[PDB]
Amino acid sequence: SSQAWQPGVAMPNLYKMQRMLLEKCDLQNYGDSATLPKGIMMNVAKYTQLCQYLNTLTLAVPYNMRVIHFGAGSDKGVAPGTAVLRQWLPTGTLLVDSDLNDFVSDADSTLIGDCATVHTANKWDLIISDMYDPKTKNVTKENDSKEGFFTYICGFIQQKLALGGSVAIKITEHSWNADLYKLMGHFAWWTAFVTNVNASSSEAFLIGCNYLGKPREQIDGYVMHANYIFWRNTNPIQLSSYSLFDMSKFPLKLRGTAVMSLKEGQINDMILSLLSKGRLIIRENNRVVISSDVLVN
Amino acid sequence: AFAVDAAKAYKDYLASGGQPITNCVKMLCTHTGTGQAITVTPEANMDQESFGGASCCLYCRCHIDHPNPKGFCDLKGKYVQIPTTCANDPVGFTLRNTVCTVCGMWKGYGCSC
Ligand SMILES: C[S@@+](CC[C@H](N)C(=O)[O-])C[C@H]1O[C@@H](n2cnc3c(N)ncnc32)[C@H](O)[C@@H]1O
Ligand SMILES: [Zn+2]
Helix, strand or coil, X not given: CCCCCCCEEECCHHHHCCCCCCCCCCCCCCCCCCCCCCCCCHHHHHHHHHHHHHCCCCCCCCCCXXXXXXXXXXXXXXXXXXXXXXXXXXXXXXXXXXXXXXXXXXXXXXXXXXXXXXXXXCCEEEEEECCCCHHHCCCCCCCCCCXXXXXXXXXXHHHHEEEEEEEEEEECCCCCCHHHHHHHCCEEEEEEEEEHHHCCCCCEEEEEEEECCCCCCCCCHHHHHHHHHHHHHHCCCCCCCHHHHCCCCCCCCCCCCEEECCCHHHCCHHHHHHHHCCCEEECCCCCCCEEECCCCC | CCCCXXXXXXXXXXXXXXXXXXXXXXXXXXXXXXXXXXXXXXXXXXXXXXXXXXXXXXXXHHCCCCCCCCCCXXXXXXXXXXXXXXXXXXXXXXXXXXXXXXXCCECCEECCC
């Protein structure tokens, strides 16, 4: 029997513990395609499977949840992933959108420009990034840890993610960052999730579940990305869109997670344990204010 | 007195045989929903498709001001249900049709008042 009825496949724990050297990625199923339901675009399918997978973790879901979505624009000028996020998230969830280029979106607010121009006053409960630069897919250069928007994402997580909050960040064979992997060790749980509908690609979502302040595990990011490529190279994932046909349990369960503003070494071992089970968010609940920097001539 | 009439321009482009605005965002759902026209979450019944609202506003898609004093889009952030037989032109369908203000359904495609 199969993972073909799952939304996707998560990196098994034994692969996280290896010490592999980086290899070229060579997917057995490179040219396969799932058969999408009629008229459904790949990005809708892909975000739906990510959300179906997130439904199985211990996400903190407060009242007045705050979600920010980077890399939300598409080359068609609409935002299919944030339409899926808005469908998944409880009604009334505050959802902010951003992309390099102009696009039309269902978010409550949209910032256009380089993510490095984006500032927010407050902390967030859930950060989704689909940011990707296709020019990183070059097989004639050594595959090194990438900077660019990954430097911003790492800083944004460390400064603007509430304790207890969660993260899902798109990576690929060539689009990755060693510090992002090291940051996954500051969550109560982490994985690399491959959606079944796009399993012919080296794309995965790095998912960090329940942010703690501190390193829980020490993770070497260069080794961990090598472990990820090794996993993908030796475990063909069958392309599948089966999970897209059962949406009866899709919306994220509204759990009313408690929100508290603690400070400093008020973070008891009891507090950390509540964070780790998805039962606590630590941040303020002021107004949400955002802005982008505008450079003048 | 001058104002750009984007709705009329689109209606006439369609009558001339233009390819309707593409890439409206069709959602996955159970197709067991209330069937109402514009909703907070996808509500298509067995004879409807649900679309993300912003990707079906002419004004939104064309980067044109919305036609009312306080430029407000009643589609953005919502989901719009389109009969499957019209779902090749969701932008057109929402322009040319009206929501029953008591029923919630499209007049002519659901309101039974
Ligand atoms: C494949 S697309 C995302 C597709 C989109 N999420 C969807 O729902 O279909 C990758 C996006 O990342 C954005 N991006 C890449 N680098 C960026 C940067 N430094 N800052 C902001 N956005 C960036 C690109 O503009 C592009 O729209
Ligand atoms: Zn009626």
